[PDB]
Amino acid sequence: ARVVAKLADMHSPEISLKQRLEYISRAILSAKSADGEFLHEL
Amino acid sequence: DIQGFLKNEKDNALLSAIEESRKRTFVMAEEYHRESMLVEW
Amino acid sequence: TMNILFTQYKRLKGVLRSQARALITFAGMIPYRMSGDTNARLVQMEVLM
Amino acid sequence: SVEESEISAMNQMSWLMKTATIELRITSLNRQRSHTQRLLHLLLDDVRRKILRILDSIQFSNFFDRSQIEQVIANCEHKNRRGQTVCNVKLLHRVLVAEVNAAAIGQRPLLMEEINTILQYVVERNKLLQCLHAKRHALESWRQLVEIILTACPQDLIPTEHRQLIIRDLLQDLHVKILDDDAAQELMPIVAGAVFTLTAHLSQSVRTELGDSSLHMILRNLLEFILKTGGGFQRVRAHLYGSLLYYLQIADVFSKLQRDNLSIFESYGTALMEVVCRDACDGHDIGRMLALALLDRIVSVDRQQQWLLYLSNSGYLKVLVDSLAEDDVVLRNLLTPQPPLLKALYIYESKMAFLTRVSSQGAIELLRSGVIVRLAQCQVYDMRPEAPVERYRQILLPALQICQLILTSSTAQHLQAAGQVLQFLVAHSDTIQAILRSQEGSLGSLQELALLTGIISKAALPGVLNELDIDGSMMELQGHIGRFQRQCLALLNRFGGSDRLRQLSLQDDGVSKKDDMELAMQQICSNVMEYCQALMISLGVVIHLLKQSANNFFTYYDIHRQSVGKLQNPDEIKELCQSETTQKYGLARRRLVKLINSRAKLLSLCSYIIETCLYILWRHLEYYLLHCTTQDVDTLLREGANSFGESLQKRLLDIESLYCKVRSRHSFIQALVRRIRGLLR
Amino acid sequence: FLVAHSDTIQAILRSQEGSLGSLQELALLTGIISKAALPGVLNELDDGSMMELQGHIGRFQRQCLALLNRFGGSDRLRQLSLQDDGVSKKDDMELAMQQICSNVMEYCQALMISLGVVIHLLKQSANNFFTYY
Fold first, then answer.
1. N or C: which end of chain C has fewer CB within 10 A?
2. CB contact under 8 A, D315 and C36
3. Strand pairing partners for D86?
4. Contact at 8 Å (CB) between D214 and D186?
C-alpha cells in the first residue's frame, strides 16, 4: 500500500493523472484489505 | 508520579462514565420489556 | 462482473485489463464503504491477471 | 517576564510552579487556610483575575540543494531536555564545515556562505524548538496548576458563582487559543485534557445549583476542535469524544435544553457525522468505546432518525456486522484459559450497547441487516463453560438480551425473526437443554433460565414450524419447539409450587435485591404462563398456581401499601441506602419508588395471571366435565367444589375490593368467580 | 426406545454425581448406545423421521465419546478424591470404568472401520497395566 502510495505522489513527468488516480484506487483497496490515519489522509 | 496519580484517577473516571451509559441503556431496555408485558396484559 | 471478466481472461489464457482497471477505479472513488471481504476479492483478482 | 531570555524565564516559572504544586498537595494533605485564602483572593479579587494574567502572558503564538540540507537539518535534530526537537546548530556547523573542506577553489566562498546560511537555519530551528518545549512546559504547568487548584481544595473556599464564572472564562480563552490557525500541532493534546477536566468541574458546579450561551458556545468549540483534528491523532479524538459525552449528560427545562442541543448538533450537518462514523468504524480502542457510546447517546436524543439515516445509507451498519464477526473472534480467544485482552469485552459491550439503543425505523433496518442471522452463525455462544461461569454468563447474557429485544421490537410476524431465533436455540440444543435442567438456585442460572424461557415463550408457537417445511428439518424443529414448551411448562412446578419455600430456605443457612428477585420470580411465572396461554390456544398445578398467587397477592398489597406509607413518610437511613443526609434520603426515595413499582407490577401480574388461571380453568373444566366422554369428571366436579372453597372465593373478592377499585373500572374478577361457581354447581 | 427417553437419556449422560448407581446407569446406557447408534441403521430407516433418528444417534455418540473425557482423564483422580472427605466398591468401579472406556473405544473402533485424551488414556492404560500385571 504505502509503496504504491509514494509511487503516485511522486513528482515526476512519467506519471499522468490517470495512472496516479488508478494507483490511489489500488491503494485504498489494498488499505481496506495508524493505517486508519493513512486512510484519512488519502 | 503526582501527575501519574492524577492520571490513574482520570482513567478510572473515564471508564466510569462509559459504564454509566452502558447501564442507562440496559435500564431503558428493561423498561421497554415492562411496558411490553403490560401491552400483553 | 469482475468474476466474469476474470473468467474471460481465464479462457483467453487457458481490453479486459483496461476494463478491470475501470472497475477498480470505480470501487475506489465510490462514496460508500463497501464491505471488507468485498475489497479483498476485488484487489486479489485485479492482481491475478 | 524576560523578553530577552524567554527560554530561561519560562523554565524558571515552570520549576517554581512544580514546587508550589507539590506544596499545595501536602498543605492540603494536612491543613492550612489563610495562605490558600490570600492567594485565592489575589487570584480573584476584582483588574483581571490573577490566574488569568498568568495564563495570559504565556503566548501560544510562535550551491546547496534544498532537500539535501533539509535531510541534514533533520539528521542533527535532537529532542532538547524539555522535549523540544531542536536542530543541533554546532554539530551542523561541524558537518557543514567538514563537507565544505571536502572549480571548487573559486566556489569555496559560496560553499562557506551557504554553510553559514544553513547554520543560521539550524540555529533558528534549535531556538524555535527551545521556545516550543518552553511553551509546552508552560502550558503543562498552568494546566496542572488548575488541576490541583480545582481538584483538591474543599469547594468551600470559593463562592460557587465565582467558580462558574472563572471556569467559564477559562474555557473561553483556552478555546480562543487552541482554535487560531497558527496552533502548533503538538500543543493540541494539552488543552484537550484541560477542557475535559475543566468541563466536568463546571458540570458538578451547575448541577449543584439545581449563561446557556456559554454551554452552547462550549459544545460548538469542542466540536470545531474535534473537526480541526487530523485523522491521525486518535488520542485527541477519544478525548474530545468523552468530553462531549459529558457535555451532554449535563442535560420542562431539561427538554428545552435537549431541543436546543439537538439543534446545535444538527447545525454541524453531515460532517461531524462522517467524522464520528469514521472513528467509530476505525479509531483507536479508547476512541472506539467512547465514540460508540456517544453514538448510542445521540441516537437516543434525536427524534427525526436523521443520524440513523446517515449511518444506514453510509453503510456503517455493515461495518458493525463485521465488527460482530470480529468480536466473535475475540470471544473465541477468551475461550482459552488465559484471556489476552479483557478490553475485547468492553468493546463488545459498547458495540452491543449502541445496538440496543437503536425505536422502530432503526429496528426495521437492523433486522434488515440480518444482524440476528449473523449471530446465528456464531459458534462461540455454544461454548457455555461446563469467574469462568461468570464469564460465560457475561457473554451469553447480552446475546440473549439482544435476541429478545429483537423478538420484541420486530412486529410479531417478521417470522424470520422467530425462525432464526429458533435456529439459534436448535444449534444449542444440548446447551439450552441443560440450562433448563439447571437445579442450582444461583441468581445467575436463575436469570439465564429466565431469558431462555422468555424467548422460548415468545417463539415456540406452532404457527412457525409449518412455514419452515418449505421436512426432516421441519420435524426436528417442531420437536425442539415441543421440548421447549415442555420445559417451559415444567418450570412452573419448580418456581411456583410449595417447593419455592425450599429455595428461599436452603440459602438462609439486602432490600433491593429482594424486590428485584421478587419481580424476577413473578416475571418467570408470568412468562411460562403466557407461553401456555398461547400454547392451548396436571391441572392441580394451575389450581395451586391461583392459590399461591392470591397468597402472594395479599402479601404484596400489604408490603406495598406499607412501603407507600413509608415513602410518604442512622440505621434506618443506612438500610434505606444499603439497597441502592440529603443524598441518602434521595437513595431511600429511589429504592422506595423502585420497590413500590416492582410490587405494583407483581400485583397487576398476579391479577392478570389470575384472570388467566381462571380462564384456563374455566375452559378446561368446560371441556372436561361437559364434553369429555367417560370417572374423571365426577372426581372433577367433586374436587372442584372441594378446592375452590368459599375461603378462596372470599379472599379473591376481598382482594378485588382491596386494590382493583383503585386501578380497574371493571369487576372482571367478580364476574369470573360467579361464572366459575356457576360451572361448579 | 431411547428417543422416547430423550430428555431422560440426555440427563442420564448429563449426570454430575459420582453415585455408584448413576455410574452403572451411564455405564449400561452407553454400552447400549455403543452397540446401537451405528450409521448402518439410520440408512435402512428411510423420512424426516430418519433425519430425527440420525440426529438423536448423533447427540448420543457425541456424548458417548465425550464420556471418555470425564471417565478416563486426569479428572478421574478428582472425582475419586472429592469422595474421601470401601474395597469391594473400588474393585467394582475399576472394572466398571475399564468397561466404560473399552466400550466407547469399540464404538470408535467400528466408527473407523482432542487426541490428547487418547494420549492420556494410553498413559493411564500403560500405568495401570503394570499395576495390574
1. N
2. no
3. D78
4. no
